Amino acid sequence: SAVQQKLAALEKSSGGRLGVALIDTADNTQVLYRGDERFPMCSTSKVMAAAAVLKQSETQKQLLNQPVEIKPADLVNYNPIAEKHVNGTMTLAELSAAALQYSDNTAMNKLIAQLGGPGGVTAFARAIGDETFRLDRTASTLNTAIPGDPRDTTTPRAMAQTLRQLTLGHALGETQRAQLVTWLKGNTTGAASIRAGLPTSWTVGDKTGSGGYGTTNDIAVIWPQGRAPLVLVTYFTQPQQNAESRRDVLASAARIIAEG
Ligand code: NA
């Protein structure tokens, strides 16, 4: 397809490896580029962990208001929000918002612990039909993003389908889904990624991720005006362990998708 030639050209220009999955819910049509290849999720896995806690809250109605202690020993390699509450508490709602909107790794680790370990996050993915997602490590090491390493990976197709079920579908209770959508729309880390390649009148909710090998990811749900929503996954990784971030590639992929 024309979109696929333009994505392949973007990839060639970039020096790295690009994975894209678009779901157009107006007709459930899909555009894929390396859609079944594995990529390191990096912090985009925080969406699955937040959604898994939201699922628990369908039975434990007050779960999101539960306070969780933040201890000095809990603070890891990137804790912009949790550091503000050391020797205090944050609720699981506040930890979910910090994980999603600031990519706070201590917050993510509290979600993982609430779920009984990374296997509890993977379990939720399996329960909603995602057989590809796997979370293996906690937040300080899950984004090493080593080529060929299956840990902490998924494919663009699988993550696009899962994100659609979580935000537009009914994998979550209606109120939980609405909460996740609100959190994603309030993300603060995405301005240079998918959002930068889209018309300024489209509403976006997204979660970014970055890691070793210049891995630069973004997963988004997109609401154009007067048109059915879209789900877009853009994953990107590079050959050199020390490679720099390339959020521009994700913006460019989004732009190509939107023009198609
Ligand atoms: Na690495």
State the distance from the centre of ligand 1 to the C-alpha of 250, rounded, in angstroms. 20
Active-site residues: which are they? 43
Alpha carbon separation from 17 to 32, 34, 45, 158, 162 (Å, rounded): 14, 9, 19, 17, 22
CA of 144 to the centre of ligand 1 (A): 4
Full set of structural domains in the chain with CATH: 2-259 (3.40.710.10)
* Resolved by: X-ray
CA of 214 to the centre of ligand 1 (A): 9
Which residues are found with C-beta within 5 Å of the ion, ligand 1?
144, 212
Per residue, the 3-state secondary structure of the chain, as one string, reads: CHHHHHHHHHHHHHCCEEEEEEEECCCCEEEEECCCCCEECHHHHHHHHHHHHHHHHCCCCCHHHCEEEECHHHCCCCCCCHHHHCCEEEEHHHHHHHHHHHCCHHHHHHHHHHCCCHHHHHHHHHHCCCCCCECCCCCCCCCCCCCCCCCCEECHHHHHHHHHHHHCCCCCCHHHHHHHHHHHHCCCCCCCCHHHHCCCCCEEEEEEEEECCCEEEEEEEEECCCCCCEEEEEEEECCCCCCCCCHHHHHHHHHHHHHC
Experimental structure resolution, Å: 1.5
